[PDB]
Amino acid sequence: NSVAYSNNSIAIPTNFTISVTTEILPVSMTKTSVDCTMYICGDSTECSNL
Amino acid sequence: GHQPYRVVVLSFELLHAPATVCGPKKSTNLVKNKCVNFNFNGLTGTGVLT
Numbered sequence: 001n002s003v004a005y006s007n008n009s010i011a012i013p014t015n016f017t018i019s020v021t022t023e024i025l026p027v028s029m030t031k032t033s034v035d036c037t038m039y040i041c042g043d044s045t046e047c048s049n050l
Numbered sequence: 051g052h053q054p055y056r057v058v059v060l061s062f063e064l065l066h067a068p069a070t071v072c073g074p075k076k077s078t079n080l081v082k083n084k085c086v087n088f089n090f091n092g093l094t095g096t097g098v099l100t
């Protein structure tokens with residue numbers, strides 16, 4: 001594109017337009033929880049003792 | 051170090067086929083729908099059988 005520059009000329013709009021756009025933003029994530037003994041040792045008890 | 055010796059080598063393969071050789075152990079009945087620790091051909095654990 002190339003707009004024409006001049007030192008004695010101006011451009012003025014004669015009509016408008018109403019537009020509606022959309023914006024999306026994350027807010028929060030999932031809350032989780034972990035259990036060390038169940039994850040690492042499972043059903044064993046000697047592993048828990050270690 | 052130069053005297054003769056006698057050698058016997060025992061080789062085991064793990065459980066992939068149905069078990070055939072293992073030592074003495076009495077077997078109980080099957081109990082289901084109850085938290086219980088079990089032993090199936092040498093593997094241990096704790097859970098519910100269904």
Ligand SMILES: *[C@@H]1O[C@H](CO)[C@@H](O[C@@H]2O[C@H](CO)[C@@H](O)[C@H](O)[C@H]2NC(C)=O)[C@H](O)[C@H]1NC(C)=O
Nearest residue numbers: 010011012013014015016017018019020021022
């Ligand atoms: C400003 O723009 C609006 C929107 O296009 C124009 O309104 C349209 O005009 C035409 C021609 O008369 C009609 O066929 C349409 O029905 C009108 N509405 C729409 C939504 O298009 C309006 O005429 C323009 N203003 C000027 C001064 O040109």
Ligand SMILES: *[C@@H]1O[C@H](CO)[C@@H](O)[C@H](O)[C@H]1NC(C)=O
Nearest residue numbers: 003004005006007008009010
């Ligand atoms: C305005 O623009 C013209 C053309 O670019 C140039 O010749 C002139 O010197 C400029 N200034 C005036 C005061 O005209």
